[PDB]
Amino acid sequence: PLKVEKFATANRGNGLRAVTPLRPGELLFRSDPLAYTVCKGSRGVVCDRCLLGKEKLMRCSQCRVAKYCSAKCQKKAWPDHKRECKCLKSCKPRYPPDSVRLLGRVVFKLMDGAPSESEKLYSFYDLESNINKLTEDRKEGLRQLVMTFQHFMREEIQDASQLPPAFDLFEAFAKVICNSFTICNAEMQEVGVGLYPSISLLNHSCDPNCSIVFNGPHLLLRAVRDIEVGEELTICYLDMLMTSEERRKQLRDQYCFECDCFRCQTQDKDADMLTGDEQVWKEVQESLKKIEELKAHWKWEQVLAMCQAIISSNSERLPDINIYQLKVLDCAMDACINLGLLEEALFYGTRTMEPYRIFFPGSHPVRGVQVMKVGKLQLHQGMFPQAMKNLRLAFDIMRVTHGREHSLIEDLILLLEECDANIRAS
């Protein structure tokens, strides 16, 4: 039985609204992707199917590009991998953009005759493209992408005849621009990109009543506050650590709309985000573009050196609550976890808490995860009474954001049970 339903909104295309009263944490929808792929910087670092990052992965024999964690994952990914293998093989070492690879998998799933669970409420053909709202430099960009697709897909596609009508390459790339989902791992690292057309019904807000989490490529939609009958359901398309000037820019350029939400109109939290001197944090912002690029490719040691440079150089002038400084700590923390330097990770991680509490109000999955990491590190250091508080706080959030269907909740409980035992012992 469905608690959500499609409806035409006043002026923001189609939307999704409640059919029944919904309480925080309530599971609204479950979907696997119509199609999905590992994103560029996680390829050969994580498994192509399940998106987990083991020590050694086994490559595909035919192309050597796809990489898997096990035989079971290589078997079950084959249907999706089958008809792209030769294209990956011939292009080497050249890799196409993620959208090209994504669409290459989609185009075949659309001829698949069996109805797609993910398209239950909304199809791929329903997705908004914003054709009539696009600027010239994006149209030109989309034209280049069509050409790349055409050259990348020679071995399997030669002509528009080999694909359904009603499908248009150009139009399809436009859909992709504003209907993509960035699949994140349990750690909240960006590992993939995929299409979930039913979930694409949800309009954006900077103060959403709903949230999504990824458990592997599986997606869960959950309410994050009390929601009344008939109330439109919204999510945030964007990372929380962005100013209202920065949010409006991305939503304009990528989603062809001016955000009119409360937070955008009232500069909500902008002053706290930009605490400190401009001339100082402008440099941090600049350094971040490189930093986030290296983190994308899992280059933890280079990430650390760059983060350490900035932190010790700014300690006397730039406060932590400055989103740019804040992002630098979070990268630095993540680098250390992946590098085994757990003492240091907690030093960095601990400084992010109160800024996160302020910037992630209520229940947000990124915060829940962040508190968990700091709680987990505090457990490893023998700081049992502090870890117990943070892991309980992590649960409070993640009960709402992750729920019992997400497998990370199990891990959290085992940490809490391990911490409770470490407390009762000493």
Instruction: Provide the annotated binding site for Zn(2+).
Output: 47, 50, 60, 63, 69, 73, 81, 85
Q: Is residue 263 a contact residue for ligand SAH (CB under 6 A)? A: no
Q: Is residue 206 a contact residue for Zn ion (CB under 5 A)? A: yes
Picked from ligand SAH, Zn ion, none, the partner binding residue 325 (CB below 5 to 8 A depending on kind) is: none
Select the span of 8-16, 107-115, 266-274, 300-308 touching ligand SAH (CB under 6 A). Answer: 8-16
Which secondary-structure segment (H or E) carries 28? strand 27-31
Picked from Zn ion, ligand SAH, none, the partner binding residue 201 (CB below 5 to 8 A depending on kind) is: ligand SAH
Angle, in degrees to the nearest 10, between helices 408-425 and 365-380? 30
Binding mask 13-42 for ligand SAH (x = CB under 6 A): xxx---------------------------
Q: Is residue 225 a contact residue for ligand SAH (CB under 6 A)? A: no
Q: Is residue 259 a contact residue for Zn ion (CB under 5 A)? A: yes
Q: Is residue 123 a contact residue for ligand SAH (CB under 6 A)? A: no
Phi, psi (deg, nearest 5) at residue 128: -70, 135
Picked from ligand SAH, Zn ion, none, the partner binding residue 13 (CB below 5 to 8 A depending on kind) is: ligand SAH
Which residues are annotated binding-site positions for S-adenosyl-L-methionine? 12-14, 122, 130, 179, 203-204, 237, 257
Please say whether the beta carbons of 398 and 215 come within 8 A.
Answer: no
- CA-CA distance, 282 to 168, in Å (whole number)? 42
User: Which C-beta is closer to ligand SAH: that of 15 or that of 362?
Assistant: 15
Select the span of 13-21, 83-91, 111-119, 310-318 touching Zn ion (CB under 5 A). Answer: 83-91
SS3 155: coil
Radius of gyration of the chain (CA): 22
Shortest Å distance, C-beta 399 to Zn ion: 27
Shortest Å distance, C-beta 179 to ligand SAH: 6
Binding mask 148-187 for ligand SAH (x = CB under 6 A): ------------------------------xx--------
Shortest Å distance, C-beta 204 to Zn ion: 7
- CA-CA distance, 273 to 242, in Å (whole number)? 8
- CA-CA distance, 85 to 61, in Å (whole number)? 10
Q: Is residue 135 a contact residue for ligand SAH (CB under 6 A)? A: no
- Judging by DSSP bridges, how do beta strands 203-204 and 234-235 pair with one another? parallel
Select the span of 12-20, 55-63, 165-173, 275-283 touching ligand SAH (CB under 6 A). Answer: 12-20
Q: Is residue 256 a contact residue for ligand SAH (CB under 6 A)? A: yes
Give, as one character, the DSSP assignment of residue 240.
S
Q: Which of 130, 55, 65, 74 is nearest to 93 (CA)?
A: 65
Shortest Å distance, C-beta 88 to Zn ion: 6
Binding mask 335-374 for ligand SAH (x = CB under 6 A): ----------------------------------------
Select the span of 10-18, 32-40, 215-223, 367-375 touching ligand SAH (CB under 6 A). Answer: 10-18
Number of residues assigned to the chain: 426
- CA-CA distance, 209 to 227, in Å (whole number)? 7
Give, as one character, the DSSP assignment of residue 410.
H
SS3 6: strand
Q: Is residue 138 a contact residue for ligand SAH (CB under 6 A)? A: no
Q: Which contacts (CB < 8 Å, 24+ apart) does range 53-56 have?
A: 53/185, 53/191, 53/298
- CA-CA distance, 175 to 186, in Å (whole number)? 27
The amino acid present at 291, given as its one-letter code, is: I
Phi, psi (deg, nearest 5) at residue 237: -75, -15
- CA-CA distance, 212 to 365, in Å (whole number)? 8
The amino acid present at 259, given as its one-letter code, is: C
SS3 340: coil
- CA-CA distance, 244 to 323, in Å (whole number)? 13
Token output for 49: 């199917």
User: Which C-beta is closer to ligand SAH: that of 177 or that of 273?
Assistant: 177
Q: In sequence order, which residues have a C-beta less than 8 Å from that of residue 47 and are 6 or more positions away?
A: 53, 54, 57, 67, 68, 69, 70, 73
Q: Of these, 39, 46, 73, 224, which contacts Zn ion (CB under 5 A)?
A: 73
Which residues are annotated binding-site positions? 12-14, 47, 50, 60, 63, 69, 73, 81, 85, 122, 130, 179, 203-204, 237, 257
Q: Is residue 209 a contact residue for ligand SAH (CB under 6 A)? A: no
Name the site residues for ligand SAH (rule: CB under 6 A): 12-15, 127-128, 130, 178-179, 200-201, 203-204, 255-257, 259
Name the site residues for Zn ion (rule: CB under 5 A): 47, 49-50, 60, 62-63, 66, 69, 73, 85, 206, 259, 261, 264
